[PDB]
Write an enzyme that holds these catalytic residues in place. Structure first.
Site, short mmCIF file in Angstrom:
data_model
loop_
_atom_site.label_atom_id
_atom_site.label_comp_id
_atom_site.label_asym_id
_atom_site.label_seq_id
_atom_site.Cartn_x
_atom_site.Cartn_y
_atom_site.Cartn_z
CG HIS A 104 0.07 8.71 4.05
ND1 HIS A 104 -0.65 7.55 4.24
CD2 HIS A 104 0.89 8.82 5.11
CE1 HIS A 104 -0.29 6.99 5.38
NE2 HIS A 104 0.65 7.74 5.92
CG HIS A 110 3.06 10.36 8.26
ND1 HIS A 110 1.98 9.54 8.05
CD2 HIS A 110 2.57 11.63 8.33
CE1 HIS A 110 0.88 10.28 7.99
NE2 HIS A 110 1.22 11.55 8.15
CB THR A 133 -3.22 7.50 9.32
OG1 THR A 133 -2.10 7.14 8.50
CG2 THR A 133 -2.84 8.69 10.21
CG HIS A 145 -0.22 -0.11 2.53
ND1 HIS A 145 0.20 1.00 3.24
CD2 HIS A 145 0.14 -1.19 3.27
CE1 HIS A 145 0.79 0.61 4.35
NE2 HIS A 145 0.77 -0.71 4.39
CD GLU A 170 -2.66 9.42 6.11
OE1 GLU A 170 -3.45 8.55 5.70
OE2 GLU A 170 -1.88 9.25 7.06
CG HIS A 216 5.27 6.14 5.92
ND1 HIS A 216 5.37 5.63 7.20
CD2 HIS A 216 4.11 6.83 5.87
CE1 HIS A 216 4.29 5.98 7.89
NE2 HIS A 216 3.52 6.72 7.11
N1 LIG Z 1 0.72 6.54 8.82
S1 LIG Z 1 1.37 6.63 10.40
O1 LIG Z 1 0.08 6.46 11.39
O2 LIG Z 1 2.33 7.91 10.64
C1 LIG Z 1 2.52 5.25 10.68
C2 LIG Z 1 3.58 5.44 11.56
C3 LIG Z 1 4.49 4.42 11.79
C4 LIG Z 1 4.34 3.21 11.14
C5 LIG Z 1 3.28 3.03 10.24
N2 LIG Z 1 3.04 1.80 9.52
C6 LIG Z 1 3.74 0.55 9.75
O3 LIG Z 1 4.60 0.45 10.56
N3 LIG Z 1 3.38 -0.62 8.97
C7 LIG Z 1 4.08 -1.86 9.25
C8 LIG Z 1 3.11 -2.61 10.17
N4 LIG Z 1 3.76 -3.40 11.20
C9 LIG Z 1 4.59 -2.58 12.06
C10 LIG Z 1 3.82 -1.71 13.06
C11 LIG Z 1 2.64 -2.13 13.65
C12 LIG Z 1 2.00 -1.28 14.54
C13 LIG Z 1 2.54 -0.04 14.83
C14 LIG Z 1 3.72 0.38 14.24
C15 LIG Z 1 4.35 -0.47 13.35
F1 LIG Z 1 5.51 -0.09 12.75
C16 LIG Z 1 2.37 4.05 10.03
ZN LIG Z 2 1.77 7.57 7.69
#
Ligand SMILES: NS(=O)(=O)c1cccc(NC(=O)NCCNCc2ccccc2F)c1
Ligand SMILES: [Zn+2]
Length: 257
Positions: free
Chosen positions: A93, A116, A196, A61, A103, A91
């Site tokens: 969006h 982010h 998010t 994604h 976002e 990363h």
């Molecule tokens: N869009 S955001 O809310 O700023 C944001 C910020 C930090 C990480 C992500 N996504 C992401 O880590 N995906 C890998 C999924 N498994 C790892 C994992 C699971 C739960 C929490 C963190 C994490 F790392 C999104």
């Molecule tokens: Zn993010």
């Protein structure tokens, strides 16, 4: 299997993840006439070591740039925090067109993309996996990206995408300090929120920069030319991955300025 299409997208996430209708969900619309200035907020301080950059990964994604997080070489301090938070990822969006890819929104205005930069509380917790579900576990800087002139600071990231075109591909991504991507002013808003996308944990203290950074129409096209399918399958471009803004549910957005 969640995503951003009409069948598995944001609007359907609550079926598998009920927290999607929670009281601390992100992103939000920042209404500046309702923000409350907090003189107790300290300046944001970032100090990142380029040697902590590790890997870039196509996660289907989106794509992620991950960092070694075994020590405090790369940390965020200040702002609303008394604890030091350890960098682990950045990363972006983006949206289907230039009109709508951020976002967070500010006074209803949608920007073209959003950066982010994510950190976890290493003063209180022993790992990202432990911290990810704690109310004070994560700290994420959001930077709104306004379409306009090409941003040369994005060059290493954009140049890496040709090696991770399809889902699951990954490649070394080294010697990079992502504080080079931040705007020159670090004036910010902050509010308690969530991841998010699923699992949508309400574990994030958000730091939203007031100043935007630029990105060109063609740089955005590079994001959208990433593929969500695995190699050999029919190509499915990563057209968008931004969640709609969510209700404040009585939360207060504080301003550092
Ligand atoms: N869009 S955001 O809310 O700023 C944001 C910020 C930090 C990480 C992500 N996504 C992401 O880590 N995906 C890998 C999924 N498994 C790892 C994992 C699971 C739960 C929490 C963190 C994490 F790392 C999104
Ligand atoms: Zn993010």
């Amino acid at each position: 299997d969640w995503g951003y299409d009409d069948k598995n997208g944001p609007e359907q996430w609550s079926k598998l993840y009920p927290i999607a209708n929670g009281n601390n969900q992100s992103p939000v619309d920042i209404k500046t006439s309702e923000t409350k200035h907090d003189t107790s907020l300290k300046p944001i301080s970032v100090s990142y070591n380029p040697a902590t950059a590790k890997e870039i990964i196509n996660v289907g994604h989106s794509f992620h740039v991950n960092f070694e997080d075994n020590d405090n070489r790369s940390v965020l301090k200040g702002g609303p925090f008394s604890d030091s938070y350890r960098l682990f990822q950045f990363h972006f969006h983006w949206g289907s067109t230039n009109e709508h890819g951020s976002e967070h929104t500010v006074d209803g205005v949608k920007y073209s993309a959003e950066l982010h930069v994510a950190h976890w509380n290493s003063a209180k917790y022993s790992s990202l996996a432990e911290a990810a579900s704690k109310a004070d576990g994560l700290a994420v800087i959001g930077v709104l990206m306004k379409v306009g002139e090409a941003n040369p600071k994005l060059q290493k990231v954009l140049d890496a995408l040709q090696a991770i075109k399809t889902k699951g591909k990954r490649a070394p991504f080294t010697n990079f300090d992502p504080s080079t991507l931040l705007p020159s002013s670090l004036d910010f808003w902050t509010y308690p929120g969530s991841l998010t996308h699923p699992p949508l944990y309400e574990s994030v203290t958000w730091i939203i920069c007031k100043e935007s950074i630029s990105v060109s129409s063609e740089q955005l096209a590079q994001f959208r030319s990433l593929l969500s399918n695995v190699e050999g399958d029919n190509a499915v471009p990563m057209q968008h991955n931004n969640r709609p803004t969510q209700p404040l549910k009585g939360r207060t957005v504080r301003a550092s300025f």
